[PDB]
Amino acid sequence: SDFDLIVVGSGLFGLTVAERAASQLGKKVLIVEKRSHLGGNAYSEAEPETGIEIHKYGAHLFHTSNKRVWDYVNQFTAFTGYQHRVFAMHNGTAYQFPMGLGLINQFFGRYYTPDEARELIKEQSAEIDSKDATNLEEKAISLIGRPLYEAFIRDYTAKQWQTDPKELPAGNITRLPVRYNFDNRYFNDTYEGLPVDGYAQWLSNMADHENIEVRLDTDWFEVREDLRAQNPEAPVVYTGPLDRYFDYSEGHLGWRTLDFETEVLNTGDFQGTPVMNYNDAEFPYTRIHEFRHFHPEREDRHPKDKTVIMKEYSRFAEEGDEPYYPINTPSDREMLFKYRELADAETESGKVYFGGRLGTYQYLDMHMAIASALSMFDNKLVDALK
Amino acid sequence: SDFDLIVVGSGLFGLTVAERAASQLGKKVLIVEKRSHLGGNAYSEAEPETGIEIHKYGAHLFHTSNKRVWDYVNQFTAFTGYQHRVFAMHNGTAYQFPMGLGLINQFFGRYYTPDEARELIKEQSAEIDSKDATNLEEKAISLIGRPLYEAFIRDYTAKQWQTDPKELPAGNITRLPVRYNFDNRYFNDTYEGLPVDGYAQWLSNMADHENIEVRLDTDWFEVREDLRAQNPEAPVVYTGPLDRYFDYSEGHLGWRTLDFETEVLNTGDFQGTPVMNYNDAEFPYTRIHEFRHFHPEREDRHPKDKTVIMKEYSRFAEEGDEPYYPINTPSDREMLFKYRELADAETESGKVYFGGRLGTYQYLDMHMAIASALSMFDNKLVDALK
């Protein structure tokens, strides 16, 4: 028998689980990854012409307030001091973003003290009682007022979810916080940074252990009869699609996908910030990423008069698209439930554990996936591998 | 016989000289300090009614790109992650500051790309060519255009120096940088932070050594005859005013001083950011500091319906005002040249060394003082107090 553990999927969840087993329990791990590379969607690589590090599966920003995770993660990479900030384009003006005093002054046309702004938001949002809000539009209005909702929320939402917010259902927003200071640090986590040597290097490291064999370009469902037969004792951590695992017997869970239009441009700086949101309906893309700006420490390496940008587009994920964000319509929810029960059975009866973004039909930040894998390793995999 | 070195003044340049003396080459040192505390103007303390750390003699922000100084400095304290950011109040709008894409957008009314912005600034500063320009005012306009100059530079300059910019020489401004991106990190030094437990602590530990004894509330001139008698080959490091040493014999050197009106308010947040510049003439003060925002990691220990602010005012420094920034008028310089030969003759026949802001008539950042002190300690001191 070849392996004590089988991990399907090479994302942060899979990797963490495989790496812990390998180095903590001394067990032997096979990682079966369907793509040609490790790391799932966190994987990055050099754009050929500029050499700038880019993401083909979406921009990734590491941040966490979990010291265990931070310490763990720092075993495989150093991190830059990068602090993620975002701006929001509305009617040809780049707004300071997360809503706070900066956006408020730009928007309403004059400076508001912290107390004056609290009062402003209340006066604006009073048009509707949260109690009386019958949908998402009303709920949002009830929280931040119609002008801010109409300026920065409505269209942006329609683009991402391709639905009128008048038609989404009110419970979808519990809160829309306004910062009543000038703090525009996008994350409020203790630790934040980008991998000094790029993502690929970091993920590659997590998998570089003597007790780990990586199997790229290999669909689990194509080789699972063999592998199970040869390693009948070995449990399985599955981070693949949950509905696909059960042969879509309860239907197909709905995801949004993302399209990325990449351009190399003959300027050294296109927007002077890593990410520009586009809140208006008049521009089809949701954001533009300019990647050089993610690693300002590399400016000497970087082209002087070239930059790579990437326009992002939201779309329902169809036959052949990469699934990215779970949609969670009522049907999706009822469907998820049936699959969740089936999974419970499978785990008990089969020693097949489900994890990760796809495995659980749930969006996970990198640090939340890592935490969840540390938990599964602790509460389940040490016993199961004992 | 009792001391191998006397250091005058407990500001950073002195603490650096005395510590590098005691710790590294062993000698026993005396520090004489006019004032009732260590640190000079760096010294912080808690404000009674709120307990918030404040500087009674001006906000101090540590930042440097000298690793040696960074290292040295950490030997005595630890630093927060704090990054300094400034906002500029003009005609009732807080502006993103250092001039860059943000300010430009707020000011000119629409978003300019990095390239578009460079065009805009070129076109606006075309009005005066650089090697034209009689005065500083014209030089500025030559570099950034007249509208920006009048909004953000003119009155603010006039407030700090109490002079008409158009009767300052053009030479005073060489570069007037506008950032053609969205970076508003105020300093661009490699290392940056505030002392986790305040400056007061940090300063103590600089002193706190065995070969270091320090007399507070002690004027050098009131006691130097005795001390020089008993300890008569011990060279002196003088960091007091260069002109008061030689009894103002060649004139009084012109300095700026700052006054600080302190207010404790019935509100947890006055302006939502540490420092707001006031660029306009209708405001007597240059700057408002709200000190709770210097240390956000203590928002628990902080009150939640109180905060303390300081309005900063600029004035010509009287004798017995605390000198802050050298004015360098032509009379000032001519005076300075003769104070220098007086001081250099004094070093060479009295073994008194002249260092620090006050001893050299020269503004020094915290880290430029330490760097300076170290290089005196090397080149001048250890050589001649073998």
Ligand SMILES: Cc1cc2c(cc1C)N(C[C@H](O)[C@H](O)[C@H](O)COP(=O)(O)OP(=O)(O)OC[C@H]1O[C@@H](n3cnc4c(N)ncnc43)[C@H](O)[C@@H]1O)c1[nH]c(=O)[nH]c(=O)c1N2
């Ligand atoms: C567009 C976009 C943007 C972001 C993010 C995600 C996405 C999609 N994330 C989340 C981040 O990618 C995170 O690492 C994952 O969500 C973690 O969950 P998984 O480990 O399951 O990753 P992930 O979903 O990447 O791993 C799944 C892997 O399993 C493989 N697989 C699927 N089926 C298989 C099969 N049958 N056989 C073999 N292999 C199979 C897949 O190929 C894939 O590599 C993020 N996080 C963050 O912290 N900050 C951020 O800014 C972002 N940004």
Ligand SMILES: Cc1cc2c(cc1C)N(C[C@H](O)[C@H](O)[C@H](O)COP(=O)(O)OP(=O)(O)OC[C@H]1O[C@@H](n3cnc4c(N)ncnc43)[C@H](O)[C@@H]1O)c1[nH]c(=O)[nH]c(=O)c1N2
């Ligand atoms: C208002 C203001 C604001 C700032 C700053 C200064 C000032 C004045 N600085 C500069 C910094 O505070 C200062 O340079 C350092 O403390 C060290 O400089 P010196 O020790 O050389 O002068 P420093 O003044 O600190 O040292 C000399 C001290 O010796 C004492 N002394 C004078 N005469 C004496 C006598 N006859 N006998 C005994 N003792 C005597 C005085 O109390 C005097 O302060 C700063 N730096 C930075 O990096 N970031 C910042 O934000 C600021 N902000």
Ligand SMILES: O=C(O)C[C@@H]1Sc2nnc(-c3cccs3)n2N=C1c1ccc(Cl)cc1
């Ligand atoms: O920017 C990001 O990386 C994620 C943002 S923010 C966020 N936080 N929680 C969630 C989700 C919960 C449940 C499903 S998605 N999101 N969704 C994002 C998002 C959603 C849909 C689309 Cl088309 C594009 C971005």
Ligand SMILES: O=C(O)C[C@@H]1Sc2nnc(-c3cccs3)n2N=C1c1ccc(Cl)cc1
């Ligand atoms: O923020 C600070 O700590 C100082 C600023 S910025 C700066 N950098 N170098 C210098 C000087 C060189 C030479 C004389 S002063 N300055 N001056 C400042 C300043 C000057 C006058 C006034 Cl009333 C107030 C602040």
